[PDB]
Design a protein around this ligand. Structure first.
Ligand code: POV
Ligand code: ZK1
Ligand code: XVD
Ligand code: XVD
Ligand code: C14
Ligand code: D12
Ligand code: D12
Ligand code: OCT
Ligand code: OCT
Lengths: 141, 164, 53, 138, 43, 92, 51, 39, 164
């Protein structure tokens, strides 16, 4: 019973591994950054640039997930994915600098740590839900 | 040198594309009737000479667009605008962008023309043998002339922008 | 009813003849081609205007 | 029930995408957008395969036109190879099914029985003025 | 760059015959034309 | 009523998962793989008597050549061009 | 005949079977493609963990 | 442009078997031949 | 390091390609008869156990080549020659060309093998369902092993020629 919704489920399943690896690297980068002359400034600048480059694909891919579900008519899942899309649209993010960070070794660091852990949990939960939906749609044949 | 060639091309193309639509010798078909874009006329029959218009009644979009033959009309408009822009480049010179505007108008003219003929030939067939007259080939020659003067206009613009 | 029938089913059962693809079949791709060209010119002008300022 | 003999209609605009079902076309679009993203991610873990320059490679490989550049790593070459196979099969399927459409024509009656003629309602059906038929229906 | 008028006619001719050339567009507005002409020639 | 036909109801006849490869028998689909490995090794052999045609690179070229796509590299010696031409004709 | 039919009249209304290829007909190549992308991601992570 | 006999034969054979050409002619008269053989 | 791997590959490939042809479990077909390259044998029937040979009577060339199964025999010969050449490279060392000779023998073995199976499968079909045994897959595994040891032999030759 191969169907468009099922194929979108598999393709989301493949991309979600990448979507997880991004947040794992973000967690590692935060941990390597918090635990601290000009060499320190160079290190923190390199980490900030890495994070700024890594931010955008993590949002564009989730944009693909929600777009694929909209175009494939799976609303029960699109509803789950909308709140993260809205947060990914800088709803809570202020307008101070384009990058995530100025060392910003303050409560902002703890906030980004906590939200990164939350994002990883959400990604893994969504991954397992996508795997279940794929198996349900295919094996039901 | 080349601005004069662009002007003569612009007005020749406009002349040919305003002679193509007004006159009625597009399609020859059956008695033999030398058709047109607006009016169909009869030949070698009980009636001759004076002649009558076409009747044109979501395929409705094709019917209305073919009827109100908008795309050749717009091609003529665009060619005229390109001609006046090239004319206005000579005066008020060194504008550096009027000539590029002309280069875009003379190409949008080609695109609207080719849509016009695709639509016309698509609506025409809506067995018997037919043939095409000289209004059709004036339209086709106007397309070629429009594209060529468009590339000449961009060439002039590039040369005049590199000279600065 | 059938023996005094104007037409018969078997004679024209296949009667298959093939004809050249008219422009009507294809024109749906000519429309897309010209639409793509118009769009390309449009985005070219948008990029030019954005880069000029 | 009397209906006009079903005869071939005028081929509509956008008929070129008849040999493949709608679901297949949508799956093709999203497969192309999935392959390009994965090729980008692969070439940016381990290299000019940015997203813009990888969408072009995938599109070039689908439309049978030669590719400008080719992946060098192993993980990029796996993606390249499997997408090449996919495009080959899809283009062969489209050409073959179109040939089937053009060779043997198969006409279907729009309506089969009154049980479905009632449900359709886009086709107008009528009786004689008055007689056995009209009295029967009333 | 390399896409003069002659090179452009050569690229478009090559793209129709499904042969493909050595030059390819490298800008967005020059890649839309290529993509659409490719699809048309494929059909 | 009357005398009426009665036949077995035609089943849906769902196509197989891998039905896209029916038009060629299984023997063909596996001799293609085996000839591909053979060609990829012979092209390496011929290029390597004593450039870019290592073994992995040669497998990549021969894969590309089968799928009508073609790569950036191409053999530049007579005895590699013979292999290329023959594999091209076969895949065509 | 009908209102007590054991087999019933499921899908009694005729559905015009189109002659276009259905996604159920070329599903094998889609399975292969998605599997290939999954394998490519596995290999691309192995390489990065290698360095 | 190189297009010696050995390289021109390879270009023609590549163009016939639908496999991508390594190089392309740059002159005009070298391009007419390419276009005709492609058709 | 790699010479030992080439030797073990050479003799394993020769062993598998001399077990493939001698034994008779190639093709399973119908009572069920586990066929072979030379001899056909019966199973689950009135007769069992002991069994009889094949009868093989310009398609005559196919019949004779399939009958006198030359190409697998030649594949076995070539693999053996490659094995002895790699053996003789260790002694009388620094010959620099015996190893390349081995690299060519182990590849001509693959080519003769693939002709052998193309011919066998082409002659086999000369409806009923059939299947392939373990002699067939020993042949197929010998091909793979032969190609791999061939590429390893060329690699060794290139390394040893660059070391000089
Ligand atoms: C000048 C610019 C574009 C050309 C404008 C065409 C006007 C003249 C044709 C009139 C016509 O026949 O209408 C027809 C086409 O009408 C369309 O809308 C054509 C679609 C092409 C637009 C751009 C395609 C995507 C752009 C590039 C993408 C990268 C009616 O089409 P419809 O309304 O969609 O109805 C479906 C018809 N059907 C019932 C047979 C399926
Ligand atoms: O007794 C009747 N016998 C009828 C026989 C016929 C026919 F069989 F066709 F000859 C017809 N027609 C139906 C349409 O085709 C032409 C005339 C009408 C009849 N009517 C009137 P009703 O009420 O409209 O059926 C009667 O009353
Ligand atoms: O306004 C107009 N635009 C036109 C574009 C083309 C032609 C044309 C010519 Cl010139 C010769 C032969 C066939 C032609 O029509 C075709 F569509 F190509 F079949 C005529 C045109 N008139
Ligand atoms: O001596 C031998 N050479 C061989 C080459 C291939 C095969 C083979 C295998 Cl290994 C698996 C499945 C099908 C096979 O045969 C094919 F031709 F590919 F169909 C067996 C061989 N035996
Ligand atoms: C790329 C070059 C391939 C050459 C193939 C030559 C084919 C020869 C076949 C001749 C058979 C004639 C039978 C009458
Ligand atoms: C029946 C209405 C006639 C309309 C014709 C006017 C168009 C002539 C050419 C206009 C281009 C400027
Ligand atoms: C009918 C005679 C049987 C001949 C079989 C001898 C071949 C065995 C393998 C030889 C390879 C060295
Ligand atoms: C530089 C003038 C152009 C001549 C040929 C152009 C055809 C589109
Ligand atoms: C033909 C397959 C070769 C893969 C391993 C070769 C050893 C360098």
């Amino acid at each position: 019973a191969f169907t468009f919704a099922a194929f979108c489920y598999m393709l989301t399943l493949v991309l979600c591994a990448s979507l997880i690896f991004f947040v794992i690297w973000h967690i590692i980068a935060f941990d390597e950054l918090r635990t601290d002359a000009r060499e320190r400034l160079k290190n923190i600048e390199r980490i900030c640039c890495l994070l700024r480059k890594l931010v955008v694909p993590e949002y564009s891919i989730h944009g693909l997930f929600c777009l694929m579900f909209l175009c494939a008519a799976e609303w029960v899942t699109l509803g789950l994915n909308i709140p993260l899309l809205f947060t990914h649209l800088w709803r809570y993010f202020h307008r101070p600098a384009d990058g995530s960070e100025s060392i910003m070794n303050a409560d902002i660091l703890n906030y980004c740590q906590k939200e990164s852990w939350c994002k990883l949990a959400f990604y893994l939960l969504s991954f397992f839900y996508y795997l279940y939906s794929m198996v349900y749609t295919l094996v039901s044949f | 040198v080349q601005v004069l060639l662009t002007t003569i091309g612009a007005f020749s193309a406009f002349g040919l594309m305003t002679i193509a639509i007004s006159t009625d010798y597009w399609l020859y078909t059956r008695g033999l009737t030398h058709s047109g874009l607006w009016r169909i006329c009869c030949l070698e029959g009980l009636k001759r000479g004076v002649c009558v218009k076409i009747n044109h009644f979501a395929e409705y979009l094709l019917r209305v667009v073919r009827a109100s033959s908008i795309f050749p009309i717009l091609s003529a408009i665009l060619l005229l605008l390109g001609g006046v822009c090239v004319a206005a480049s000579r005066v008020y010179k060194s504008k550096r962008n009027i000539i590029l505007g002309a280069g875009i108008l003379f190409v949008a003219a080609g695109l609207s023309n080719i849509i016009g003929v695709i639509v016309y030939i698509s609506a025409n067939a809506g067995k018997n043998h037919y043939s095409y007259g000289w209004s059709f080939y004036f339209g086709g020659l106007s397309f070629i002339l429009a594209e060529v003067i468009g590339v000449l206009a961009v060439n002039i613009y590039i040369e005049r922008s590199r000279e600065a | 009813w059938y023996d005094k029938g104007e037409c018969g089913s078997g004679g024209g059962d296949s009667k298959e003849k093939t004809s050249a693809l008219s422009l009507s079949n294809v024109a749906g791709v000519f429309y897309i081609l010209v639409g793509g060209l118009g769009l390309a010119m449009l985005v070219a002008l948008i990029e030019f205007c954005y880069k000029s300022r | 029930i009397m209906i006009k003999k079903p005869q071939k209609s005028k081929p509509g605009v956008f008929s070129f995408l008849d040999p493949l079902a709608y679901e297949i076309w949508m799956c093709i679009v999203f497969a192309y957008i999935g392959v390009s993203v994965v090729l980008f991610l692969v070439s940016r873990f381990s290299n000019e395969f940015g997203i813009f320059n990888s969408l072009w490679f995938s599109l070039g490989a689908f439309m049978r036109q030669g590719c400008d550049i080719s992946p060098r790593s192993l993980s990029g070459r796996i993606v390249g190879g499997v997408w090449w196979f996919f495009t080959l099969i899809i283009i062969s399927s489209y050409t073959a099914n179109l040939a089937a459409f053009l060779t043997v024509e198969r006409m279907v009656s729009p309506i089969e029985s009154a049980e479905d003629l009632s449900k359709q309602t886009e086709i107008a059906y009528g009786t004689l003025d008055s007689g056995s038929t009209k009295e029967f229906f009333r | 760059n390399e896409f003069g008028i002659f090179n452009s006619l050569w690229f478009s001719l090559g793209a129709f015959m499904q042969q493909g050339c050595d030059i390819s567009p490298r800008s967005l507005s020059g890649r839309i034309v290529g993509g659409v002409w490719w699809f048309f020639t494929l059909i | 009523l009357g005398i009426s036909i009665m036949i077995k109801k035609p089943q849906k006849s769902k196509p197989g998962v891998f039905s896209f490869l029916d038009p060629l028998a299984y023997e063909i689909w596996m001799c293609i793989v085996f000839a591909y490995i053979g060609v990829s090794v012979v092209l390496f052999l011929v290029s390597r008597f004593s450039n870019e045609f290592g073994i992995f690179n040669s497998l990549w070229f021969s894969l590309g050549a089968f799928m009508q796509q073609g790569c950036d590299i191409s053999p530049r010696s007579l005895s590699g061009r013979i292999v290329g031409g023959v594999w091209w004709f076969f895949t065509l | 005949w009908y209102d007590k039919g054991e087999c019933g009249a499921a899908a009694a209304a005729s559905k015009a079977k189109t002659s276009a290829l259905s996604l159920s007909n070329v599903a094998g190549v889609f399975y292969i493609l998605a599997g290939g992308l999954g394998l490519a991601m596995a290999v691309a992570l192995i390489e990065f963990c290698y360095k």
